[PDB]
Structure formats: C-alpha cells, structure tokens
C-alpha cells in the first residue's frame, strides 16, 4: 500500500473498557475526526507462546468483512513491535454479561428480544458460511439503544464446504459433537443459542458442574432440567436447540418464527 496506514499516534486512548486474555480493550478517539471507538490490544509475545496467531488472523479477516446491525464492526487493524491492535466499533452499554450479573435473571421479553437480535445476526453469518463458535454473555455487547451486538470472532471460521474438527469455545457452551471428537458445522452456534437462552432465563448455564469432567459428561448426555418459572414455550425452544443430534436442531429461521419468540420479542 501507498496509502496512509493506521498508527497508534492516531488515537487518544481513554479508559479500559474490558480485560481481554491477551490485553485490554480501551476506549479511544481518532484524533482527526474525534470519532469514538474501541481499541483491542493483543501482546504478541503472549500470542506466540499460546500459538493462537492463526486464530487472530481469522478473527480479523472474518470480522472486518462482516457488515450487520447486530454484529460489532471491525474497522481495521495495525500492529507494532510488541502488540497488535484491532479498531473496533465502541459498544456504549457494556456486556450482556454485566447486565446479567446485575439483574441475576432476564425476564421473557428481554430474553426473546436478545435471542432475536442474535438469531438475526447468526443467520447473516451463516449466509456467509461463517461459524462464530464463541457465543456467550461476555462476547455479547449492548449498543446505544440496548441492542445486542455479537463480538469476539476469535474462534470463528469460514466454513464454505467442509466440516470442522476443532474443539474451541467456552466450557459451559461447548456442543456435544465437539466434546465427543466428532466433526461439526454451523449447527454448533444453534446449540450455543440454546445454552445462552437457558442462562438468560435461569441465571446459570444448564450443564454447570463442579469439575471439567462432570460438565463434559452432562453435555454429552444433554443432562439438565428447568426451574419451575421457565414457561412452556421457553422449554420447547431450548429443548429443540439442545438436541444431541446437530441435524435435529432448528434452523435460525425457525427460531425467529418460534411462537415464544414472536409473542415476547
């Protein structure tokens, strides 16, 4: 490129917005236009020791080319001698994770609204053959109007044709097919959505156990129950998303038309 490239000197850095595994995400303002955004920092030495350099590249290439109202925007990136920087769209209201600690549980209206935004977001993603694979409260942010925005494409992949073999994601959200050493596809995000919907309503993931081994066991068996306040419609939906057989889980278009979703969304 013969064009001016990004540089750290281009942004005034503000306070930290969050703590990531390989560095913090700071609020920031581009100096010439005063546009407010978020700066995700990654320390290169940490990335090298972890051997996650190829996943960083997939995060950047996949997220930067995605364009949707409920997916966090990746404007660009730049690296220097010790770290790598992602120029992200600023999410003003924080994470759904934080809102979930505060409210402890989400009522049905709030839960269906979020599921709907996320389901629309995932549908657009799949139409591009991208599988997120790390859907969870800490990766869901809130925009200026309280609208959900999917973020963190760290474990994402572009799967045009073939299935995948990677185990990746968060323990409580892992799909059975991954744990069991089987191949997987975009249906893993449908499982994540069921896990996520349950957590929104109950306040905790359905397979939470005291050890790693016990959680693997419960996911593989799809062992969980609902507290008494979870209505019939929510149970019908989560039960359909949480099918051991990936083929039997609903399409995102079905979730969006689910009676419970349309009545409360």
């Amino acid at each position: 490129s013969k064009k001016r490239q990004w540089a750290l000197e281009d942004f005034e850095i503000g306070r930290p917005l969050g703590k990531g595994k390989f560095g913090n995400v700071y609020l920031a303002r581009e100096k010439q236009s005063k546009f407010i955004l978020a700066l995700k920092v990654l320390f290169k030495a940490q990335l090298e020791k972890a051997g996650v350099e190829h996943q960083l590249r997939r995060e950047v290439e996949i997220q930067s080319h995605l364009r949707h109202p409920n997916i966090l925007r990746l404007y660009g990136y730049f690296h220097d001698a010790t770290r790598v920087y992602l120029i992200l769209e600023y999410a003003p209201l924080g994470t759904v994770y934080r809102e979930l600690q505060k409210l402890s549980k989400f009522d049905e209206q709030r839960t269906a609204t979020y599921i709907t935004e996320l389901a629309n977001a995932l549908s657009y993603c799949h139409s591009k053959r991208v599988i997120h694979r790390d859907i969870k409260p800490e990766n869901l942010l809130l925009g200026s109007a309280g609208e959900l925005k999917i973020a963190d494409f760290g474990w994402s992949v572009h799967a045009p044709s073939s299935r995948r073999t990677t185990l990746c994601g968060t323990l409580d959200y892992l799909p059975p097919e991954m744990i069991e050493g089987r191949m997987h596809d975009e249906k893993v995000d449908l499982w994540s959505l069921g896990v996520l919907c349950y957590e929104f309503l109950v306040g905790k993931p359905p397979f939470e156990a005291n050890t790693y081994q016990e959680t693997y066991k419960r996911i593989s068996r799809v062992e969980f129950t609902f507290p008494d306040f979870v209505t019939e419609g929510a149970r019908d939906l989560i039960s359909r998303l949480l099918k051991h057989n990936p083929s039997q889980r609903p399409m995102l278009r079905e979730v969006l038309e689910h009676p419970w979703i349309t009545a409360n969304s």
Binding site: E30, R57, E61, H158
Partner: peptide
C-alpha cells in the same frame, strides 16, 4: 507474521465488502 487480508488504511470517519467470503470460496487452483 501479522499480514492479514483485512483493512489497515487510515479512514476519514466523517466522510459491498461481504462478497469477500463467497468470492474466496469460489476461487480456483
């Protein structure tokens, strides 16, 4: 190596990309 097929050019924030996926899926060799 930190050379990614993604944007790195300075942008003027005051003043259709997703085809990249299918176009890369359809390319041959």
């Amino acid at each position: 190596s930190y050379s990614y097929d993604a944007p790195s050019d300075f942008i003027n924030f005051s003043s259709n990309i997703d085809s990249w996926f299918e176009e890369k899926a359809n390319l041959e060799n």
